[PDB]
Design a protein around this ligand. Structure first.
Ligand code: ADE
Length: 261
């Protein structure tokens, strides 16, 4: 399994772009694509995981573990009290949990369990963060940096603190890798906090449906309209691959052949 490092504490737009490039290039299947857009592999291709190490301004780190097949964050690790501490979501199976344990913290003689005692759905994370919408949880480079320092090497912390960190890291890492539009929202706002707009949220919520729509399209025409949101919360009725492709970083895995370019 590869570990890709992103230096949050000394970040620049260019360094974030390179991070996104490296993460997409590691995660993607070596060959699968539809309409020129790289696709994630089946669940059997090895390595099955990618690690993402986030470094703050004091060189504290948190390492996220991502599933390659769907880019979900499965859990994360930090160094505390001389040990590797692994924090796994509670909706990960026993088999995958064993992988997470041993991939984040291969030294079984110096590690510690500190579970994430809730599941990894956005509805749950929002509940734990106290917000009715993750539009209300700002994203940003300084926020991500600050959040790392509230958790890494910290014995005990609240579920709210953790969920806020997870919302920010999931969106700035996995969702940005999935969607060039979201990468670009981070880059346009690189120097400030920002609230994810309706188009960010819509893309996040519809990634699986978008992959299927692109995979199924014939001669660039979607088989049925795909309704998303524009950034002003108006409806975006997508009819062709041409309209959605610029926003895409990675397609979710979809079995079967497609129009490849
Ligand atoms: N834990 C997670 N990781 C990646 N994408 C997600 N979408 C919702 N929860 C997520």
């Amino acid at each position: 399994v590869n570990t890709i490092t992103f230096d949050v504490g000394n970040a620049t737009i260019n360094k974030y772009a390179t991070f996104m490039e490296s993460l997409r290039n590691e995660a993607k299947d070596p060959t699968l694509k539809c309409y020129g857009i790289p696709m994630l592999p089946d669940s059997n291709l090895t390595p099955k995981y990618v690690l993402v190490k986030l470094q703050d301004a004091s060189s504290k780190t948190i390492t996220l573990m991502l599933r390659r097949n769907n880019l979900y964050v499965m859990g994360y690790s930090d160094l505390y009290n001389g040990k590797c501490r692994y924090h796994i979501f509670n909706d990960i199976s026993s088999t995958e949990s064993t992988d997470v344990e041993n991939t984040l913290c291969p030294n079984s003689n110096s590690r510690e369990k500190k579970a994430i005692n809730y599941n990894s759905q956005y509805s749950t994370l929002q509940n734990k963060a106290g917000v009715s919408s993750r539009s209300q949880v700002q994203l940003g480079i300084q926020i991500l940096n600050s959040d790392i320092g509230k958790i890494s090497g910290v014995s005990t912390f609240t579920d709210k603190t953790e969920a806020e960190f997870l919302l920010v890291a999931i969106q700035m890492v996995s969702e940005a890798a999935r969607f060039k539009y979201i990468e670009n929202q981070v880059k346009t706002n690189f120097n400030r906090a920002f609230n994810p707009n309706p188009k960010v949220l819509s893309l996040e919520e519809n990634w699986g449906k978008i992959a299927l729509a692109i995979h199924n399209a014939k001669n660039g025409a979607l088989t049925s309209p795909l309704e998303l949101k524009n950034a002003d919360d108006t409806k975006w009725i997508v009819l062709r691959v041409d309209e959605i492709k610029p926003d895409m970083g990675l397609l979710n895995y979809v079995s079967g052949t497609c129009q490849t370019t």
